[PDB]
Amino acid sequence: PQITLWKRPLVTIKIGGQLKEALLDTGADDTVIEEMSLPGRWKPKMIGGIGGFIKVRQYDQIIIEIAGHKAIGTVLVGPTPVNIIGRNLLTQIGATLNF
Amino acid sequence: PQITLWKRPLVTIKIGGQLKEALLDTGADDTVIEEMSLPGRWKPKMIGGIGGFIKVRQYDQIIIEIAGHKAIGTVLVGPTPVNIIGRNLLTQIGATLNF
Ligand SMILES: CC(C)CN(C[C@@H](O)[C@H](Cc1ccccc1)NC(=O)O[C@H]1CO[C@H]2OCC(F)(F)[C@H]21)S(=O)(=O)c1ccc(N)cc1
Numbered sequence: 286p287q288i289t290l291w292k293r294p295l296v297t298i299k300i301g302g303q304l305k306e307a308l309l310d311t312g313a314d315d316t317v318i319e320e321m322s323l324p325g326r327w328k329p330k331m332i333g334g335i336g337g338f339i340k341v342r343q344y345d346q347i348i349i350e351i352a353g354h355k356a357i358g359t360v361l362v363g364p365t366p367v368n369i370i371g372r373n374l375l376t377q378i379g380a381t382l383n384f
Numbered sequence: 385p386q387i388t389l390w391k392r393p394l395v396t397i398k399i400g401g402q403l404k405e406a407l408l409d410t411g412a413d414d415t416v417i418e419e420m421s422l423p424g425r426w427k428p429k430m431i432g433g434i435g436g437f438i439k440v441r442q443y444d445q446i447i448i449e450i451a452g453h454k455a456i457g458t459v460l461v462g463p464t465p466v467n468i469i470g471r472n473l474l475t476q477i478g479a480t481l482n483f
Pocket residue numbers: 308310311312313314315316317332333334335366367369371407409410411412413414415416431432433434466468470
């Protein structure tokens with residue numbers, strides 16, 4: 286689709302068997318999701334933000350479905366105020382900014 | 385143009401006759417730029433992200449060029465880690481997300 290930016294670009298995702306709403310965020314290098322369980326190994330990470338950092342768990346090789354499109358990549362899990370789909374997974378669904 | 389997301393979507397902006405680099409950020413409601421001098425009065429605003437909130441100065445009806453496209457609108461100034469072009473000005477330059 287073509288998504289205008291008059292409102293937040295929110296979409297439905299499927300991750301870990303769960304449906305969630307997430308923000309398509311070209312200003313995010315990586316994907317960050319609110320606390321949930323995911324399978325496999327993880328390692329700690331700090332991720333930056335406009336106001337400072339939060340501690341997250343880094344899970345690699347996680348499959349997500351993003352508005353109907355399957356991707357695989359790293360997902361960070363931690364106390365983000367909103368679920369955000371970052372560039373690491375936006376590239377995989379072929380998302381571009383056009384003007 | 386059509387901007388892919390394998391790297392950060394950084395463009396040149398021009399504000400107060402100065403060139404700066406800024407990130408095109410669909411996850412930002414608001415344009416926020418690092419400390420600089422802007423004309424006129426400002427109003428207070430609170431904006432929040434990963435790591436919490438920052439206090440910013442809101443300047444309205446500021447002339448800003450973004451990747452060669454003219455915009456005139458609200459610019460927030462504060463301790464953001466990078467200059468961010470948010471949806472309030474992305475809509476003025478006709479940007480959409482596409483996949
Ligand atoms: C700051 C920017 C360089 C990076 N961020 C992504 C942003 O898109 C962020 C994404 C974001 C969205 C919503 C809440 C938290 C973060 N938006 C944001 O801070 O926008 C602020 C300016 O306008 C307001 O609108 C949303 C806001 F946050 F409120 C304010 S981020 O959230 O800090 C971030 C950093 C690293 C990773 N991997 C993922 C995300």
